[PDB]
Nucleic acid binder design. Structure first.
Lengths: 147, 244, 121
RNA sequence: AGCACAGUCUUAACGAUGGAUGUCUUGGUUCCUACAGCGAUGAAGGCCGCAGCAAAAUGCGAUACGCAAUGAAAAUUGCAGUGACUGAAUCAUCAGAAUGCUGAAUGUAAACUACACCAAUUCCCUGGGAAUAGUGGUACUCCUACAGAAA
RNA sequence: GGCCUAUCGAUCCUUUAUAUUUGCAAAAUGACGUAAAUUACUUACUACUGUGCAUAUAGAGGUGUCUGAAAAGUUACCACAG
RNA sequence: UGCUAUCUAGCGAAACCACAGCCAAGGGAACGGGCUUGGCAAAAUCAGCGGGGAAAGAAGACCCUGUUGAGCUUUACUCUAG
RNA sequence: GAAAAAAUUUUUUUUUAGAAUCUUUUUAUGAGUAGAAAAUCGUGGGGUUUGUGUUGAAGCGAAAUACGUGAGUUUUCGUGGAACAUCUCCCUAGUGCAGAUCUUGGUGGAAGUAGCAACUAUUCAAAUGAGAACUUUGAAGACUGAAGUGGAGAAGGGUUUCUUGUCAACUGUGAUUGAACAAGAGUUAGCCGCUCCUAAGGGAUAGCUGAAAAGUGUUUAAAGGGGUCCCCGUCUCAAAAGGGAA
RNA sequence: AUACUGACGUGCAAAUCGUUCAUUUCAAUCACGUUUAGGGGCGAAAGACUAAUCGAAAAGCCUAUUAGCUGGUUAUUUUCGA
RNA sequence: UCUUAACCCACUCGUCUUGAAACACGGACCAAGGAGUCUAGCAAAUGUGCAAGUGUAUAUGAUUCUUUAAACAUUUUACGCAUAAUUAAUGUAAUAUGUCCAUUGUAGAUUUGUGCCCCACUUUGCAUACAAUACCGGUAAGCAAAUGCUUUAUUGAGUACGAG
RNA sequence: GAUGUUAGGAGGGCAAAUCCGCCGAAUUUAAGCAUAUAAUUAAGCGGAAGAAAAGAAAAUAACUAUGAUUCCUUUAGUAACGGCGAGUGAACAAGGACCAGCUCAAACGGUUAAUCCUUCGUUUGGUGCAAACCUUUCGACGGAAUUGUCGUUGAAUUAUUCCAUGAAUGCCUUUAAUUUGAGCAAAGUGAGCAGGAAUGCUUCCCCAUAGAGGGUGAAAGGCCCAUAGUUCUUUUUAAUUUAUUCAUUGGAAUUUUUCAUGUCGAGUCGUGUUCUUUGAGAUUGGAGCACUAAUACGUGUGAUACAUUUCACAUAAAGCUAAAUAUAUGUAGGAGACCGAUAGCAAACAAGUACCGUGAGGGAAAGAUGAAAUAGUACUCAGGAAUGAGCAAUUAAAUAGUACCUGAAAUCGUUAAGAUGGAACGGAUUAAGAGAGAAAACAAGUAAAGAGGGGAAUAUUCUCUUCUUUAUUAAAAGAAACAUCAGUGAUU
């Protein structure tokens, strides 16, 4: 590290890259976030707009795991098949892939993107978006609610 | 030591005496009396920043990166030009990828080991190593750094039942087990193209390792082989090429 | 070395050499044994006693043979009869010889020394 | 055998002066491993001693820089003593010794080698004979047990 | 809103308006409402559901040293940084 | 008149010291020992002296500045023993 | 991919490039504090490589037809007497001084100068010794002038005493002197002090408070003494000038 | 310890020396022993004194306190450059 | 090379400073020591590895046991961040085929063609810029028997065939 | 309840890094400051251990649930607290390290407590040299205690299986680990050269499951100790190895079948209040104070005050408990991309010393001769004595002479050279002096006679080559001068 640092660039130059007029002082604005509102307000406004004051209720003891949900969009569901499985379904319209999204850790199925139309697929999941259910039904697939 | 350069009782004697504004020891009849105390300028004052214990002892460098370095260093060891370039004497070796029978992994003596290297033609390397036993220069020597000695052969082995006892006590010659293979030993000082001596067992096992054979789905969690698309044909051939 | 309990640091080894007990000093007052005797007992080396007979192999007095006068165990000097030296005023003392500069011919053999020779055999 | 102005300045040679540099190094240093409490059975701390010739560290305690025992084991020397053809001289180990005066310090004390009181006490010899005012015991709180006192 | 150029105030805080929108953390508080059923720990179906607190949005209460510290004197006894 | 000074023999410091040391005028940080143009300018010394060295002391105690203090006081704000 | 010269058509001599952050070539341009960048150079250690060492290294002083714009590098001569480099590449750093009234250590100019200025005065002759204004003896002259440079003592010092040596340092001049230095010797108590007693006082017990540490001191006592079962009744240290046995 | 603002003022001395003057049988002086300790004591009162130390001692620690303020802040070439 | 000469030039360095040769300050002299660092957490840049994943964390394993205090391996499917967002908050969270397909423009790198090379026409149209529409969460307004809707407004660190 | 120098015993004190208790601030931060912060930290007084502390549910969840503690990874800089400013700040799950349980009390047992203890005793084993330890049941004599010791964890009743038990005879074998001290432990003290003396240089040898390390008159695998390797002896704790009969007593676990539905820690919980404290918020924990409970269908929980009711989960107010974990302290090791004597622990040393402060306290300077002083400056001369000198004298070396390595700069002495009219030094540019140097700064080849090296031919014939020397022909190189051009000026 020490080979390449700023001291090696400035070593004989007296004011050290920190200004002959200025003369580098211990804490020339005071500590940390102190100048907010008071004299660094312009910095806070232009770079940190939401910062000051309160919003909303207090939950007091939230717990993350109650609301924990990983989501997946329908577009990427056929991608959860390996290559040979995807070829096999593409060939054969007699059978649908069943997809248990839980093994892949997902719990809500969302509606984004296109599908290769006229091919059934069974989606098993806890939760589905309104659009996702409609598109899965539209393409001839099935939605299965399961805990 | 953490408190060093500050343990003594001292303060600035202050204005009214023309002396420096630095802290002085305010002792009695002895030569410490009014003597310069704390800080890097003063005698006994210690470092400007004394060393804290942590100075980034654990760095990462990825599993994939480490694996790549080993594979590429073994590949480099393969290359004849690189072996010579690294400074190994190598003119009378039959060709650089040296694979020998597994009889080496049953040897007993230092004498047999020396005879083996001579038979290979690595006599000149052994001479360079034997000569290169010298007492080190500089003020590090006395911190248990007595010698500098150079590096010759690395024996890459499957079984420990000869090489371990045989090439032990041989100056400048190292052994390493084929599964174990350290990058620091394969490329000393960061210098690619060490002279690597392989058992037929080790050489064959190397192929199995990167061949996807045995050990079910375990190896690198279903993965093998660094294999980027950087490539040759040599540049001069491409330009010379009649269509080009 | 291959043992990882015993130190290989220079500092400690030197300290042990310098602050050595008398028995330790006696141990390192060993000399190589003369070639036929070496062959006879298959014994490389023996600790010298005061009345032994050495040949000198090193220093300016190499190739002088003779009886050992006195041993100084402490400062690692044996004294041999024909390595006399006069002092600055001309008075004669014996030149001190390091024990690794000499090869031992005739050992004086006591009961204890004989028991040691029996141990070696 | 004569000749050189002196001083000041500068220069070179050769030195004094000074202890830098270099070279060392039985020292520090940090980390890691490992075990890990001593004390009324009187500790740590502190004094006072102790060497044939002996001041200071070290060591040791009136048996005092070693005693006994062990393992090594013939030397030891500054002078001077001493010992060896293996319980001496030398080392290391050190399990048996000894263990000053104090100090919690505990008989009352304290700029005291002061002062009480109760036991007199120790040794030799195989059931007796000699020595010494010396040596011990005697703090405060507590507990378990015992005692004669009381309400 | 005032013929035009002049007539005034952030966040936190307080206070009252507003909602077929919300929360108070395992549950419930309109209501056994509406239907059926009743050998019962019955089964459906309902857009508008306790006090108190918390919100969200909208004003207003104030910062005239007016981009908003809860702030008087004195030292010829004085100290220190400049 | 004494004691010093003075000179000798012996002994023998210190403060201080960018480098130093003749002036006039000009300009220039508007008052130069050195700069520019002039006056001029010849060793080594011995004794005095206080013109000048804007002589020395020591981060002017004056004065001003600090969102550094401290002492003291009140019907300054906020506490608190009694 | 052949140019020239020397020789005496044939011999000899010089040169004869391919490194793409490289080489050939052209044209333009060049101020610089604060400040930013790049290319270098040097120091400590490590891995790596291939070297230097006792026919003398590092280091150092004097230098060099020396090299580089420069930082610097290299070398010669002299000293020196043991370890020394790495530019082949790269990690690592307590890494480059003129300056801080820097820190620490040495040293000058100031300067043989300031100075060795309280307390009336010393002289003569001798002895000692290598050497005498200031050691010793004698003779003179004087002073302190009993609130003494006199006797005794306390504090405090602690062998300074004393004899015998003695002169390296010290004895701010000299010095044979010495309260300096070395070797020894020297302090003897029934009656002289302390030692005993209480005072002004201090520390504790009994208690009681306080987390404890401590704060207190008869203040809710079943604790030391004397008599022949009774009667007294907190303890202890505290005066080297009070009291006190000779 | 009044005055000579005497001598001294790199001292004989971190308050000395000379001369002058005030005090002397009492609210007298001196010793020794004793008491009260740091926002504390003690003060015939001066912010006096409390071991050369006082408008808050000395010692050590918190502590390398803090500082919009002062000083210092180390090799070269080359480039752009306020 | 060193050395005086002589001619011409040459004011105490450092310093804060509008302005220092200053009657501004620090510097008697010399030597050695002597000052932008280390850790934490964040950012951009660039290198480097992998990619809709990535990082083996703690930890287990070994003929790992001078070096070895790291190096090696990951069971004969944890966690961080990124993979869709929004929001006080319950919550809600499609650019759609009903040839893997199918977002709209205008500039715009690259490609096809024509008449042994630049060209002038055409041809295809990345990146990016400048827009355009959608659609998703918030908030409105309009409606409202909820898979609450709705032309139409707005708002978000939004999205429009993943980039970390 | 006293009293006892009653008999047997204990506590006290020191040390402190990690550990635990109290008590308990300010500088600081906010560019001020008063809340917040610093900080439940520093100081203060106490208590422990080799680790402690915590610990067997008055737990978390709301799941398909988990299930003593500690610790790591984590959640998480998140919920949250805060002049909502500065700033501050948890828990649950999950992955692991690691995992160990429990017993008092109350309840239950009255055939006379089945208990406990001191003192006195007494013997069946076993080691050790001896000291001594170690097992071992049996009696007394005292006490304690029913104001409660011991047993027991509902109670019997069935069948099974296990576990303690005592005697006889047999029998204590082989190994593996683990950990101490022990030993044994490879080859050259070969040439030759220069050397003060090799371990150097060469050259001819070797040994290596030892080419770590140190010492050896200069760098040593082969000089020594050590080292690698092994052979034993030491610690314990595993496998193996053998049991066979005769004996009482007692106990447990299940299992039937009956019958019993008992129990469950109070000035404590709780509430009010205060202050403290925290993440706790219309009060999180603590503590002070006031009021003060309920019995298992109780009452403690489910992070917003409340009432009325669920449901899930727990069993407070008594106690113990190994392990993973911590360890700036003490001691013992092993270390190092650390420091190398102004550095580094204040301390490489006769340093926590000298010395200083009334005292609490403060606290240094301070390493190096040489290979060997069992090489330490002999002797002589001149010297009062210091000392000096030597034709003398140790050493390889004394300008190595013990305040001894190397020995920089400031500073100053000698000699020599130059200079020198109120500064000094410098730059730019020549000069004259004084020094140094020949490598670009001249001489290829040929003949004569000295020294080397090679190659070919079949250790020695032929022949190719380079240095010294004598003299003997070339040449090239730079500087001049003029002429000649091209570029650029000036002139008439």
């Amino acid at each position: 590290a020490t080979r390449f640092k700023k001291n090696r660039k400035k070593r004989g130059h007296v004011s050290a890259g920190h200004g002959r007029v200025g003369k580098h002082r211990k804490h020339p604005g005071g500590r940390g976030k102190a100048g907010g509102l008071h004299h660094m307000r312009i910095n806070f406004d232009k770079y940190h707009p939401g910062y000051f004051g309160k919003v909303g209720m207090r939950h007091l003891n939230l717990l993350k795991n109650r609301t924990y949900c990983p989501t997946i969009n329908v577009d990427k569901l056929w991608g959860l098949l390996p290559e040979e499985k995807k070829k096999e379904f593409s060939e054969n319209k007699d059978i649908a892939p069943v997809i248990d999204v839980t093994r892949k850790g997902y719990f809500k199925v969302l509606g984004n993107g296109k599908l290769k139309h006229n091919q059934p697929i069974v989606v098993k999941a806890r939760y589905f978006s309104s659009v996702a259910e409609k598109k899965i039904k539209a393409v001839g697939g099935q939605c299965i609610l399961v805990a | 030591k953490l408190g060093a350069g500050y343990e003594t009782s001292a303060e600035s004697w202050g204005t009214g005496r023309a002396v420096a504004r630095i802290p002085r020891v305010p002792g009695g009849g002895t030569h410490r009396a009014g003597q310069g105390a704390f800080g890097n300028m003063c005698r006994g004052g210690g470092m400007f920043n004394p060393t804290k214990i942590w100075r980034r002892w654990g760095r990462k460098v990825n599993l994939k990166e480490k694996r790549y370095a080993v594979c590429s260093s073994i590949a480099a060891s393969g290359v004849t030009s690189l072996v010579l370039a690294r400074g190994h004497r190598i003119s009378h070796l039959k060709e650089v990828p040296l694979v020998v029978s597994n009889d080496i992994e049953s040897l007993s003596k230092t004498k047999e080991a020396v005879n083996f290297l001579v038979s290979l033609g690595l006599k000149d390397e052994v001479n360079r190593l034997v000569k290169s036993k010298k007492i080190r220069a500089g003020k590090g020597k006395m911190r248990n750094r007595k010698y500098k000695i150079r590096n010759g052969p690395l024996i890459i082995y499957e079984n420990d039942n000869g090489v371990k006892k045989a090439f032990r006590n041989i100056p400048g010659v190292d052994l390493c087990k084929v599964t174990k293979l350290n990058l620091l030993k394969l490329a000393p000082g960061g210098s690619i193209g060490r002279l690597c001596i392989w058992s037929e067992s080790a050489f064959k096992k190397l192929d199995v390792i990167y061949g996807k054979i045995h050990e079910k789905k375990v190896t690198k969690k279903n993965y093998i082989l660094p294999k980027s698309i950087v490539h040759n044909p040599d540049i001069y051939r491409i330009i010379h090429s009649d269509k080009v | 070395k291959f043992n990882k309990q015993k130190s290989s640091s220079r500092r400690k080894m030197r300290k042990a050499h310098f602050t050595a007990p008398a028995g330790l000093r006696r141990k390192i007052m060993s000399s190589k044994l003369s070639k036929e005797l070496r062959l006879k007992y298959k014994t490389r080396s023996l600790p010298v006693r005061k009345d032994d007979e050495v040949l000198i192999c090193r220093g300016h007095n190499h190739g002088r043979e003779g009886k050992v006068v006195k041993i100084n165990r402490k400062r690692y000097k044996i004294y041999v009869e024909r390595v006399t030296r006069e002092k600055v005023n001309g008075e004669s003392t014996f030149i001190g010889i390091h024990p690794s500069n000499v090869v031992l011919t005739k050992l004086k053999v006591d009961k204890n020394r004989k028991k040691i020779l029996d141990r070696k055999a």
